A paper describes a structure:
P. gingivalis expresses two antigenically distinct but structurally homologous type-V fimbriae that are important both for attachment to other bacteria and for invasion of different host tissues. Surprisingly, despite being unrelated in sequence, Mfa5 shows a striking similarity to the Gram-positive adhesins RrgA and GBS104, which both have a vWF domain and a number of IgG-like domains that appear to function as the stalk to project the VWF domain toward ligands, presumably those presented on host cells.
The first domain, D1 (amino acids 142–418), forms a Rossman fold classified as a vWF domain. The vWF domain comprises a cleft harboring a MIDAS motif with a bound Mg2+ ion. Intriguingly, the vWF domain is inserted between strands B (first sheet) and C (second sheet) of the D2 domain. Interestingly, an intramolecular isopeptide bond connects Lys111 of the first β-sheet to Asn518 of the second β-sheet. Instead, the isopeptide bond is stabilized by Thr517 (OG) and by Tyr486 (OH) via a water molecule. D3, encompassing amino acids 547–664, comprises six β-strands in a twisted tube-like β-sheet that can be classified as a ubiquitin-like roll.
Residue numbers in the entry: 99 to 418, 419B, 420 to 664
The structure:
């Protein structure tokens, strides 16, 4: 009925630099993981144990109470396995004879509960309704999701509360089902009248005894029909009670209170409040009235069992539920940031098998650089992850003044470029509430390696950049290319052949290198020869070229003009 607590969810994201070994295609590489973690929920559950300590559980039958005492302690310890540190579970304790006794309010104190169970002692009278009423009183203060009453009895109730403004309509005759407690108690009292029907053998007063036409107390009276003002109140005839209590104010064919039915009636009020009722029958001789009364008192017949060693050992193994699902539905949107590309993602569509994906499926849109991860259901106490490799696009970073992230603190490089513009989980939580949202952390990175490209271009006589046909252009980057571009690698350690110049990540100041052309004379395929010149805008021999983690792609433009041999 009440909703359990929601399973906690948390998200994390981080970029791990690719190292030992570095990525061979591009050392500016990071493995980015997005991670969803679910925790756990124990559903709160309150239990009231109700134990029959009536005289029928003692004397000749003392193995009954002894078994209730042994099994009740076992149940307490099974449901409170960590004692006062047990999450979610509390147990209260009621005993009863001719009146109920509140032995413990709700507690996790297993030693206290077991001590009270060990002190049970047989006392005349079996006021099962009263035990159940006290359990209902105790359970009324519970705010648990699950609420259980466990009744441990030999099943023959012999006392009950008075019925207000009692009339003949508060009683009922044989149902025609020989196994109904009504029919059983009537037949039983016909066969064994002095075992069933309230009578003090010491006094001359005697009840009228029942026949097949007699009427016994109903089990479906409204709660307003019982007088609960005194929780030790009884119905008696001739100063005593019994499995049937004669009501002398009503005539032939004779009317009898039926405590087993009153207890079923009282349990119905508990069921109407949403409580689960378990009954355990300690009369192992198969007395149908007792067992069948306890079956009807329980939530259903499967919540009754006889107190055999095997049934007792197996009972109440997991009274506390744990929530199985942490996320019912989830969608992670992850926009990769400018300057970074995802390894091997060339077209839109399903990229699940191009990434490492623990759960669900991943879609990629090339134009927006957006990963959409459909998680599916994620269980509690679990983690779901996707991991993909990104590379830095050096020429894009060179050509664009990308902002740095000065707010995130997770690294790996504080103050670096974002790997993600935004990543968000939208999900349906463990109770089915949709549109829950969590924002992932923002990794930041600085490039570790740059490049220096050397270009070999044509100028005219007057030092102007030109196309091959002589038309002047605005910049050397537009001029005719005479020789394939190549890369420059300085001396010193830390650089990676063929082109990767190790960068100083601790500064934004350009690191300058002395870059020479590979050659100062170029002879083309057509036999024309070109000689190196230093002109406005062009790189001298050698020339200072600077790179940094923010501007990692330097470009030298070496100018050449035609050598004319006539
Ligand atoms: Ca008598
Ligand atoms: Mg008894």
């Amino acid at each position: 009925r009440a909703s359990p607590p929601v399973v906690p969810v948390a998200v994390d994201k981080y970029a791990v630099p690719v190292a030992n070994p570095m990525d061979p295609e591009n050392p500016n590489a990071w493995d980015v993981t997005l991670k969803i973690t679910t925790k756990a929920v124990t559903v709160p559950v309150d239990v009231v144990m109700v134990i029959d300590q009536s005289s029928s559980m003692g004397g000749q039958n003392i193995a009954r109470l002894k078994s209730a005492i042994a099994s009740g302690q076992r149940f307490v310890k099974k449901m409170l396995p960590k004692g006062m540190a047990t999450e979610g579970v509390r147990i209260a304790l009621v005993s009863y004879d001719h009146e109920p006794h509140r032995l413990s309010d709700f507690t996790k104190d297993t030693a206290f509960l077991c001590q009270k169970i060990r002190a049970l002692t047989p006392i005349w009278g079996t006021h099962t309704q009263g035990g159940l009423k006290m359990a209902r009183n105790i359970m009324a203060t519970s705010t648990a999701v699950d609420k259980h009453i466990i009744l441990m009895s030999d099943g023959l109730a012999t006392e009950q509360y008075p019925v207000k403004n009692v009339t003949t309509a508060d009683f009922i005759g044989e149902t025609g089902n020989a196994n109904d407690p009504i029919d059983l108690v009537i037949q039983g009292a016909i066969n064994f009248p002095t075992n069933y029907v309230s009578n003090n053998p010491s006094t001359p007063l005697t009840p009228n005894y029942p026949t097949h036409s007699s009427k016994v107390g109903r089990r479906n009276l409204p709660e307003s029909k019982f007088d609960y003002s005194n929780l030790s109140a009884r119905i008696t005839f001739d100063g005593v009670a019994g499995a049937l209590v004669y009501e002398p104010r009503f005539p032939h064919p004779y009317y009898y209170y039926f405590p087993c039915n009153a207890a079923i009636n009282e349990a119905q009020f508990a069921k109407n409040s949403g409580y689960t009722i378990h009954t355990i029958g300690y009369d192992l001789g198969d007395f149908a009235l007792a067992n069948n009364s306890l079956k009807l008192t329980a939530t259903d017949e499967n919540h009754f069992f006889t107190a055999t060693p095997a049934n007792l050992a197996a009972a109440f193994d997991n009274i506390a539920q744990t929530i199985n699902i942490g996320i019912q539905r989830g969608e992670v949107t992850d926009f990769v940031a400018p300057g970074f590309i995802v390894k091997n993602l060339t077209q839109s569509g399903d990229v699940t098998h191009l990434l490492n994906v623990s759960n669900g499926t991943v879609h990629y849109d090339v134009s927006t650089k957006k990963l959409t991860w459909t998680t599916g259901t994620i269980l509690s106490s679990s983690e779901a992850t996707i991991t993909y490799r990104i590379y830095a696009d050096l020429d894009y970073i060179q050509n664009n003044d990308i902002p740095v992230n000065t707010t995130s603190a997770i690294g790996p490089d504080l103050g670096g470029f974002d790997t993600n513009t935004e990543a968000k989980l939208t999900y349906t939580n463990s109770n089915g509430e949709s549109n829950q949202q969590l924002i992932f952390p923002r990794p930041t990175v600085k490039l570790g390696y740059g490049v220096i490209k050397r270009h070999y271009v044509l100028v005219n006589k007057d030092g102007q950049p030109i196309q091959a046909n002589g038309t002047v252009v605005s910049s050397l980057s537009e001029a005719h290319v005479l020789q394939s571009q190549d890369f420059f690698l300085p001396s010193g350690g830390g650089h990676i052949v063929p082109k990767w110049i190790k960068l100083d990540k601790t500064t934004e100041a350009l690191q300058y290198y002395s870059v020479p052309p590979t050659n100062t004379v170029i002879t083309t395929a057509d036999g024309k020869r070109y000689r190196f010149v230093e002109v406005p805008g062009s790189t001298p021999n050698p020339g200072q070229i600077g790179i940094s983690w923010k501007k990692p792609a330097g470009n030298a433009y070496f100018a050449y003009k035609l050598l004319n041999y006539w």
